[PDB]
């Protein structure tokens, strides 16, 4: 019966302050002068844009739309860019991965950005090319909140990414919110290390010893290493492997797989996690000792296995079963919540310790989100067709396909692929 | 008792290991080939240089001088195959400071370099102008071990600095070993904030409650804020101030004097100390919250007060008396090593807790060492005159004065004050 407020959860903003930041960010409502009447006019622009009824009121159908996860770019024009209507004065663009996300290993990401780019390359003359040094046309990067351009992010969900239109400087740059659970669209993605299935992805959920696991577990081991099944039925198929995690083991370097040593001192700074400090490739690395400078031993942390997200438990793994208010639990739940969020206790019983965390959810397919972001980098803007890739709101699609609207959009801008013979 | 290996400490070097490295860095003795007659012939070029009995062997005369803190530049030249005998092709030179030391406050450092530059201009037509953005002629920075130029430092004591001869690229650059207790020549310096003497240096030692204090203390304080008397007798003069630290307070930013939060996350990384990450002016800062991105709250860290140096006690003061190897000590000891450096346990007992730190010594004058380095930055080389500022081995001179050797050297380059 009880729906309680957890000791530590991210404070939901008021329907009002939610509408103000939304209209201000995606509509242009005067940052400080977005009071009742001046917003009513705008509120209706938002409403018109989406299928909503141009009431100009904060009706639920509206705030319900405002609450869904979506892109960072606006839905309205900068009140008409006389000077602008972007284009790439060339059909050969170059991109560069400035930085990554721990959720995915470098190759998956690299590939996603690749596949995202082909989407538009399939229907236009546009040809993409990754470069590893110096300035690129499209500079890809991951960041949180404010990351260096005065268009900050907002925490898990809400804004996911954005990109600038074609041009110089940051023109074309695509930026993804580093506070999202970056996946391929269907839950956490972790690429296994060693074991009998090195390189395969953990398969969630997997069946093991009559139990289902939706994340890497250290069950059955005493070395505390996290493993998982690269297939569903671990009994039938015996494929498994080890989940990345810098506190367990490094990948490369010269430490020979020893785990990162936190904090480790590098020059005038003591890092308590992996960094990219002193690197250009955006590959995190770390000191496998307490003084990198002294003993130059180090390793790389190419990915990270997420046990739990948010909460209080700093990522601490769920504990099954766990007691929550007189009821024992054997899985994640929405018990005590409202929203839809599945959580679990990161200790034996919750009542006694009151330590929890969110269970990783479906996250956002980097491919889809990126494909979209790149649509902008080419010059495209949001479409009202909710089926179009360039639509503001995020929607997962098992098997993607460019919407006619999109194809009509990118081509009116770059023309179709050249008809060879 | 024997010689014990302390936690986190560096690995000792042998008398010979040392010599061989010293003759390698400073004399050009081939690493793997520095032995037998080469070690002998070379040992002698070195003994001659420092006016030692040109024995040719490793003898308590040579060794003793080999382990004296000295500049990290060579003693033997090559400036034949090393590009043209350097010399800025203009009297208008510019220096930019890209890094500082937690040992001294931004200003005190900024000055020390300035005063050190002035030491060369006073006798020549050369003028130096600091710049705050861009590629200056002489880039000043502090770094440890390998700090990005192939010529690594070595932790406490030893090579104290190094600089490159005038020229494009890294030429003129002057780098300082960040593992050193940088001081004004007479021991630790701590410019105090607030209190009734804000802006004043801590006076070590200072007498309080009929007792001596050679570092800041939270003593006679309940909040645990560190302070010190800015004059000796705390009674005849009631002036004092609070000593800086990132654990107690911060400066500027928007944190409003709040402590740092370690660790605090800044984008894809967790910082367990202040950093300059992001800045381009070497100023240390830190999140005063657990998520700087989220809270946007931060404050600078201008100087760190130290009551002990190095070790695993991260600064924590000594504990007298303390117990080491069953025995009890009421003062800093050297018990347990071959280098006779003074250390102390930061806890009534060491054996079980194993927490130690180096009793701060006199440190090195940033002024003088800077003065020296800037000498190379201008084209000069080491002197065999122990008086000359350009002599390699470091030596504190309260009343510093350029040697007649130095003045001649610098101005046979540039000529005298116009």
């Amino acid at each position: 019966s009880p729906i309680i407020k957890f000791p530590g959860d991210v404070a939901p903003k008021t329907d009002k302050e939610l509408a103000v930041q939304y209209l201000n960010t995606f509509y242009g409502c005067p940052k400080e002068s977005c009071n009742l009447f001046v917003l009513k006019d705008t509120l209706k622009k938002m409403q018109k844009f989406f299928g909503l009824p141009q009431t100009g009121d904060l009706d639920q159908n509206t705030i319900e739309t405002m609450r869904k996860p979506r892109c960072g770019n606006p839905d309205v024009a900068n009140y008409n860019f006389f000077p602008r209507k972007p284009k790439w004065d060339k059909n050969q663009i170059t991109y560069r991965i400035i930085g990554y996300t721990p959720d995915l290993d470098p190759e998956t990401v690299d590939d996603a950005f690749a596949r995202a780019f082909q989407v538009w390359s399939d229907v236009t003359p546009l040809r993409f090319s990754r470069i590893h040094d110096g300035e690129a046309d499209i500079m890809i990067n991951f960041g949180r909140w404010e990351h260096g351009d005065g268009y900050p992010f907002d925490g898990k969900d809400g804004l996911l990414a954005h990109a600038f239109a074609p041009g110089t400087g940051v023109g074309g740059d695509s930026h993804f919110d580093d506070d999202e659970l970056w996946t391929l669209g269907e839950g956490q993605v972790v690429r296994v290390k060693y074991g009998n299935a090195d390189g395969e992805y953990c398969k969630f959920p997997f069946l093991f010893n009559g139990k289902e696991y939706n994340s890497c577990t250290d069950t059955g081991r005493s070395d505390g290493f996290l493993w998982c099944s690269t297939t569903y039925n671990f009994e039938k198929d015996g494929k498994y492997g080890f989940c990345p995690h810098e506190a367990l083991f490094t990948m490369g370097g010269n430490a020979e797989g020893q785990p990162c040593k936190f904090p480790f001192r590098f020059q005038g700074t003591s890092y308590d996690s992996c960094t990219t400090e002193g690197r250009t490739d955006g590959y995190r690395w770390c000191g496998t000792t307490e003084d990198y400078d002294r003993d130059k031993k180090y390793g790389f942390c190419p990915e990270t296995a997420m046990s739990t997200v948010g909460g209080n438990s700093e990522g601490a793994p769920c504990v099954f079963p766990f007691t929550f208010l007189g009821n024992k639990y054997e899985s994640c739940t929405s018990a005590g919540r409202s929203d839809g969020k599945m959580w679990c206790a990161t200790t034996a019983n919750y009542d006694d310790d009151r330590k929890w965390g969110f269970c990783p959810d479906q996250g956002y397919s980097l491919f889809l989100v990126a494909a979209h972001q790149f649509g902008h980098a080419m010059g495209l803007e949001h479409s009202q067709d909710p089926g179009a890739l360039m639509a503001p709101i995020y929607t997962y699609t098992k098997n993607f396909r460019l919407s006619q609207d999109d194809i009509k959009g990118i081509q009116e801008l770059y023309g179709a692929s050249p008809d060879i013979d | 008792s024997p010689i014990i290996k302390f936690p986190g400490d560096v690995a000792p070097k042998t008398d010979k290991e040392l010599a061989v490295q010293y003759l390698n860095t400073f004399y050009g003795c081939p690493k793997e080939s520095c032995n037998l007659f080469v070690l002998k012939d070379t040992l002698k070029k070195m003994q001659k240089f420092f006016g030692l009995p040109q024995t040719g062997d490793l003898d308590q005369n040579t060794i003793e001088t080999m382990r004296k803190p000295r500049c990290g530049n060579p003693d033997v030249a090559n400036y034949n195959f090393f590009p043209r005998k350097p010399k800025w092709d203009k009297n208008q030179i510019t220096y930019r400071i890209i890094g500082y030391t937690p040992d001294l406050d931004p200003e005190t450092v900024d000055d020390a370099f300035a005063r050190a530059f002035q030491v060369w201009s006073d006798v020549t037509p050369l003028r130096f102008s600091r710049i705050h953005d861009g590629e200056a002629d002489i880039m000043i920075n502090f770094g440890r071990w390998e700090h990005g130029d192939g010529y690594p430092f070595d932790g406490k004591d030893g090579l104290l600095a190094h600089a490159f001869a005038p020229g494009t690229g890294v030429g003129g650059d002057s780098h300082f070993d960040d593992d050193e207790l940088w001081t004004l020549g007479e021991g630790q310096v701590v410019r105090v904030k607030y209190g009734n003497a804000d802006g004043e240096y801590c006076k070590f030692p200072f007498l309080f409650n009929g007792k001596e204090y050679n570092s800041c203390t939270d003593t006679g304080r309940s909040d645990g804020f560190l302070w010190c008397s800015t004059t000796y007798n705390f009674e005849k003069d009631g002036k004092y101030g609070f000593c800086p630290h990132e654990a107690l307070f911060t400066m500027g930013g928007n944190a409003e004097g709040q402590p740092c939060k370690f660790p605090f996350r800044f984008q894809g990384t967790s910082y367990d100390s202040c950093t300059t990450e992001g800045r381009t002016d070497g100023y240390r800062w830190c999140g005063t919250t657990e998520d700087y991105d989220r809270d946007k709250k931060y404050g600078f860290c201008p100087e760190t007060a130290m009551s002990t140096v190095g070790g695993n006690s991260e600064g924590a003061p000594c504990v007298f008396p303390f117990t080491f190897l069953g025995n009890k000590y009421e003062s800093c000891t050297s018990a347990g090593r071959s280098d006779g450096k003074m250390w102390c346990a930061t806890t009534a007992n060491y054996d079980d807790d194993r927490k130690w730190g180096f009793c701060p010594d006199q440190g090195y004058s940033l002024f003088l060492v800077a003065a020296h380095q800037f000498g190379h930055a201008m084209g000069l080389e080491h002197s065999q005159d122990p008086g000359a500022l350009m002599a390699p081995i470091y030596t504190y001179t309260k009343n510093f004065r350029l040697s007649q050797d130095d003045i001649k050297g610098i101005q046979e380059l540039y000529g005298a004050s116009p």
């Binding site: 996300t101 721990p102 959720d103 991951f142 949180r144 580093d178 506070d179 250290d218 505390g224 996290l226 995690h245 810098e246 506190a247 367990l248 990162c260 936190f262 308590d272 996690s273 992996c274 960094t275 990270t304 296995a305 997420m306 046990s307 739990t308 438990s313 700093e314 990522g315 601490a316 793994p317 | 660790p263 996350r265 984008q267 894809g268 990384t269 967790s270």
Partner: peptide
């Protein structure tokens, strides 16, 4: 430690 050092 499992979980992981905070940071991305």
């Amino acid at each position: 430690g499992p979980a992981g050092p905070p940071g991305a």
